[PDB]
Task: inverse folding
């Protein structure tokens, strides 16, 4: 059996992060905690979620188990859950997931894991640039860029980190030097990405959340967000466009 | 003449509660206070509003009087009124209603009471189950059920009160025991109702408001809400569906 | 060169006030401060904006300069600016405007002032009535009138200031006596105006902002708003309808 208790905000945020890309997903309850990964239909973005066992109020599992979940449903139900509610998830067999919060108990039929798209592999990306900043600040940068173009360039070097967008008659540059960043290795990298996806990624993040960016040149970017008081790690990987 | 003064929130809430079902209504200014009742077009729900004279800041009437009011208009005008404004209602003759608040005076033509649908009678429902709880908690239960089905079962017995909804692959159960409820008589009852109407009823209620449910088996349910600091009694009665 | 620093709220509010009427505008950086005036396409309303140099945190200009600005763009970009951000505007040449706030630098191509509709002249209106009140209160009056009609009468005399609207079966009167107003000269005047424009004007104002109304009979009304902590003067002039 699986029986865990987590804050409502933790469940709502991780559910929202996953459903942003897929409507169904395999959820692994491992000895070390919860894990889930998925790639979107267009194969342009991937999401990797990790909730260490210590981020849960209670984490009791017998054997490690994988369940198939209808993410659209859990997301819909999560909207009736308060961020301040404590939520208990229970799986006694293999066909039903119980979600309890307040005076309510929701029961949803699980999906056969095999019926879900094959479990994707995590790319062993070798990236030279590492940038650590506030997720809210990043979110604002993307929001500003979104008003100028549908594509942005991420650039890193010894002088800092920049996010640039160019339009027909206007342009915008977000720039932070090493001293302004939380952590920065000065690695040299430059890649271009779709603003649409970046904007969607930021919907589960805000001021106070940590963001670690792993960047290369003409390589997918890794955006590692630490959310909900640092209880969850939500990494989004986005394929690159041609930077020239 | 009729001359009363009430809080903006009191007028806004009671107006909203009535217009939810009808666009016109007879408003009775009785020695004991304000009274109004109406049934919706489909004859599926009824609303009974009572504002005791002591809930008003000022309640001065000569003789008991009944006026016909265009509820869509009062509701529209009430949107320009603040919950913290004090509102004065005046009827000097029989054709005009004056609504004063802030530095504004609104005058609306009254409707001939006779032109309005016959005054409905209050059903003398004999119900075995009585449940008293927080209206906000009830509202949340209905909101959760609404995500699962368009119908819900209300069930009461010695073990408490439950609200259940079932879908094709999921279900939800809200349950509170006698100790969790404010007041409960343990009466046995079970009826099914439309979530659409229940959801609409709850729009004028929130955490802190009292709700008394009178329930029977295959009988209309009585939902007595005490709103605006307990100043108004707004009872909604909803016809049942077949529970089996 | 032009180099000024202002609060985000100041830029956002003045930008919104101007774009309400036009999509392009001439902005004058004078020794005494910023000035801009424009009339809408229908020639029914005009806006005159004045930001004294002392309302800026920094105001450094070489020679007085006039620039042409795409107001739709600045407005769009201003949405990514926080009211609490400090914004720096820089014009080093004549073709580019730099907008800096936070860690972002926006560059927009300027418009040739000549390509913009001829600079309008300020009408030397001679009006007998002067009314000073809270802009938020005025805004509420217009909002109330808007529910009754698409036209309102502004009336002033020794007994105070009134805003009246009449519908088929209802009416509304907003009235404030001399003692209730901040300043009032008791001038006699009566004119009728379009609620649509008045409502739009009030979108940049709120409680706490000062409004000085200059009113005549069958003459355009002057609505002088002092916004953003009294840092900006935004005057709207609205052509009259036939009052009878």
Result:
């Amino acid at each position: 059996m699986i029986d865990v208790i987590m804050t409502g905000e933790l469940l709502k945020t991780v559910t929202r992060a996953i459903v942003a890309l897929v409507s169904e997903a395999r959820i692994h309850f491992l000895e070390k905690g919860l894990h889930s990964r998925a790639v979107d239909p267009a194969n342009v973005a991937m999401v990797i979620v990790d909730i260490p066992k210590d981020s849960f109020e209670v984490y009791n599992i017998d054997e490690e188990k994988t369940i198939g979940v209808d993410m659209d449903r859990i997301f819909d139900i999560s909207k009736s859950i308060s961020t301040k509610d404590l939520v208990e998830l229970i799986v006694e067999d293999e066909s039903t997931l119980k979600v309890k919060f307040g005076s309510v108990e929701y029961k949803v039929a699980l999906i056969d894991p095999s019926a879900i798209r094959k479990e994707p592999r995590i790319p062993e990306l070798e990236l030279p640039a590492k940038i650590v900043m506030d997720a809210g600040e990043f979110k604002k940068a993307i929001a500003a860029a979104d008003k100028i173009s549908d594509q942005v360039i991420f650039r890193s070097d010894k002088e800092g980190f920049r996010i640039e967008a160019k339009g027909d008659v206007d342009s915008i540059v977000f720039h932070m030097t090493e001293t302004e960043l939380i952590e920065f290795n000065g690695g040299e990298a430059r890649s271009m990405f779709s603003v649409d996806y970046l904007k969607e990624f930021c919907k589960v993040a805000g001021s106070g959340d940590l963001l670690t960016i792993h960047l290369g040149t003409n390589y997918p970017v890794r955006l590692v967000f630490e959310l909900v008081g640092g209880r969850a790690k939500v990494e989004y990987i986005l394929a690159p466009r041609i930077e020239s």
About this structure: The longest strand of chain A covers residues 45-52.
